Design a protein around this ligand. Structure first.
Ligand SMILES: NC(=O)C1=CN([C@@H]2O[C@H](COP(=O)(O)OP(=O)(O)OC[C@H]3O[C@@H](n4cnc5c(N)ncnc54)[C@H](O)[C@@H]3O)[C@@H](O)[C@H]2O)C=CC1
Ligand SMILES: C[C@@H]1CC=N[C@H]1C(=O)NCCCC[C@H](N)C(=O)O
Ligand SMILES: [Mg+2]
Ligand code: NA
Length: 259
């Protein structure tokens, strides 16, 4: 359970702006374009009701405001209800929400009431970050290092296998590693035997999980993980093309997936 903190979400508009430019640089597409490639969809001011939730750890400072900003950025007609929980859900439906957006400590979801489609943040995030990684314009081959094979990492790796990549997976939990190798057919990556990658997808809640031996100049590191998977020093040394943003890209993936 690695939950966002209010500090992760400070100046979310700038974080999203910067992530969008990096995505354009790496892939030639903006985030909307990535979403169009994945799902074939575009926004048309659909009304999105964002419902604060007091369950578990409770309301996270900046969370709903951040979803508010994220959804406006992508062209949705969004709003945040005054009431939380079930009273908030009611308020949202009654005020004409077409899509509901809400999270407890275990599930962040988007539910499109017009067409019944529903998205879970975890696979949506893994998929979009892996898609971004896969579209690095100047990569020499379909070879990608995946570090972290949990709720985000595994569907990301699955997506890459489906796009005919050689996927090299590592997870510190050896049982997760085994399951993923047998279910997905990924290559089990041994850090003691390192190679350089130009494409890396990382989804862990830990810092400095990408060692120097695995980097090449201008390599792409596409990572929803928090805190950052690579030190500032290694990032500067190898001119890493970092795609890393705390909420928006995954939220976009959810929303465009239910359109
Ligand atoms: N930026 C965004 O939009 C989003 C970010 N997240 C964040 O992404 C991260 C991953 O989330 P989940 O996949 O749901 O967590 P999870 O706990 O299901 O998976 C994390 C995996 O990383 C592995 N791991 C930890 N340290 C490692 C290391 N040094 N080397 C290799 N593997 C290691 C763990 O064994 C675990 O399997 C968390 O930080 C979460 O907060 C989650 C959803 C969206
Ligand atoms: C969706 C984020 C991305 C990474 N971890 C996930 C997380 O922190 N989930 C918990 C969000 C709880 C929201 C709270 N219930 C509120 O409504 O403010
Ligand atoms: Mg994101
Ligand atoms: Na990380």
């Amino acid at each position: 359970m690695a939950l966002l903190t209010p500090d992760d979400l400070i100046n979310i508009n700038m974080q999203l702006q910067k992530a969008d430019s990096a995505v354009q640089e790496v892939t030639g597409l903006d985030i909307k374009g990535i979403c169009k490639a994945l799902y074939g969809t575009f926004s048309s001011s659909e009304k999105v009701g964002i419902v604060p939730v007091t369950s578990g750890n409770g309301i996270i400072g900046n969370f709903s405001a951040s979803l508010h900003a994220i959804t406006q950025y992508f062209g949705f007609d969004s709003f945040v209800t005054d009431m939380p929980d079930v009273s908030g859900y009611y308020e949202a439906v009654q005020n004409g929400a077409e899509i509901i957006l809400m999270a407890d400590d275990r599930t962040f979801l988007a539910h499109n009431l017009k067409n019944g489609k529903m998205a879970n943040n975890q696979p949506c995030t893994g998929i979009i970050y892996a898609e971004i990684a896969s579209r690095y314009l100047k990569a020499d081959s379909k070879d990608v290092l995946v570090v972290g094979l949990g709720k985000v990492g595994f569907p990301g790796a699955e997506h890459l296998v489906q796009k005919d990549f050689r996927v090299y997976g590592y997870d510190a939990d050896e049982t997760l590693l085994e399951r993923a190798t047998s279910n997905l057919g990924i290559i089990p990556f041994d850090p003691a035997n390192p190679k350089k990658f130009s494409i890396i997808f990382e989804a862990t809640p830990c810092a400095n999980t990408i060692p120097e031996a695995v980097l090449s100049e201008n390599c792409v590191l596409s990572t929803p993980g928090i805190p950052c998977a690579i030190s500032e020093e290694l990032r500067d040394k190898y001119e890493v093309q970092l795609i890393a943003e705390p909420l928006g890209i995954g939220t976009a993936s959810m929303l465009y997936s239910v359109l």
